[PDB]
């Protein structure tokens, strides 16, 4: 009974190559990149999102797949969905990366730090920080890596204004929103330090007191049959509105079990029909500007009847 919601930039003036910064802890920290990279290999989901927000998706030649997955993300359109794979984000395939003969490689120090020297020997390589709450800084690093700092500045400025405008029109500050993600065996309740939390903050939506922690991304509650038969407490998940995504198909197949469970039916948001199923790629795994706009779109339901 839970409603389902789901959810080319011109280069800066300069020479044909530019210096760009790697994330802190990458050696070396500076890398010379082309001003107009024609064949980009992207190894992290947030950078793929960034290239789409910059209108550069037709220059991507391959992308690392989400781990345990067998396909590219679909929330970014068919051109990205059809991209060849180069292994997964946690284990990129260097032979396939070399086979794409890229002139630019984007990756993340939070995913494959050990791989940077081998990647840099194939093509100019830029590593951003780990994806998550700092997505806007990661976007800024993609902007420098593609010589599109001005373009990224406008995307960030336009997003902040757009998010604030949506929050004002829909009275976001008067609602506490909960962020929940189901896995096959557990329920994850996200706090205030992660990708979707930072987008809810940009819109101005409040969070329930149980979801304001910042020491970790989420807390995890068991949801197996043995767990449910031990009278668990899901009250950390309650709010005025609950946004719930499923981390996998097996999680989706068990979602209705948890939503029908006695511990979940105790939640006031469930009684009030204010639990909404949302796209996990938009809310959890994309972690970029296009995903962020999808979350803002879903947040338009905070003041719905």
Numbering used by the authors: 42 to 48, 60 to 357
Which statements did the authors publish about this structure?
Mtb FecB and FecB2 are predicted periplasmic binding proteins implicated in host iron acquisition; however, their precise roles are not well understood. In vitro ligand binding experiments for FecB and FecB2 were performed with heme and bacterial siderophores from Mtb and other species, revealing that both FecB and FecB2 bind heme, while only FecB binds the Mtb sideophore ferric-carboxymycobactin (Fe-cMB). Mtb FecB and FecB2 are both members of the type III PBP family. Each protein structure is composed of N- and C-terminal lobes consisting of mixed α/β structures with a central β-sheet surrounded by α-helices, with the two lobes linked by a rigid “backbone” helix (α6), forming the characteristic fold of the type III PBP family.
The structure of FecB was solved to 2.0 Å in space group C2, and the asymmetric unit contains two FecB molecules (chain A, 42–356 and chain B, residues 45–357, where numbering is for the unprocessed FecB form). Notably, FecB has an extra N-terminal sequence that associates with the C-terminal lobe but has an unstructured connection between the N- and C-terminal lobes (dashed black line). The substrate binding pocket of FecB is quite different from that of FecB2 in contributing residues, shape, and electrostatic charges. The FecB binding pocket has three tyrosine, four asparagine, three glutamine and two arginine residues along with a glutamate and aspartate residue, Figs 2A and 3. The binding cleft of FecB2 contains three arginine and two glutamine residues along with one glutamate, aspartate and tyrosine residue to provide polar contacts with a bound ligand; and three tryptophan and three phenylalanine residues. The resulting FecB pocket is narrower and deeper than the FecB2 ligand-binding pocket, with one side pinched together creating an almost triangular chasm, Fig 2. In contrast, the back of the FecB pocket is negatively charged. Indeed, this charged environment trapped a polyethylene glycol molecule from the crystallographic condition. Mtb FecB has highest structural similarity to ferric-siderophore binding proteins such as Bacillus cereus YfiY (2.5 Å rmsd), Staphylococcus aureus SirA (3.1 Å rmsd) and HtsA (3.6 Å rmsd). Out of the ten variants tested (R141S, L163R, Q233S, R240S, Y242S, Y270S, E272S, D322S, Q336S, and E339S), there was only one variant, E339S, that had a considerably reduced affinity to Fe-cMB. Ultimately, the affinity of the E339S variant was so diminished that it was unmeasurable due to the solubility limits of Fe-cMB. This acidic residue, Glu339, is situated at the back of the FecB ligand binding pocket.
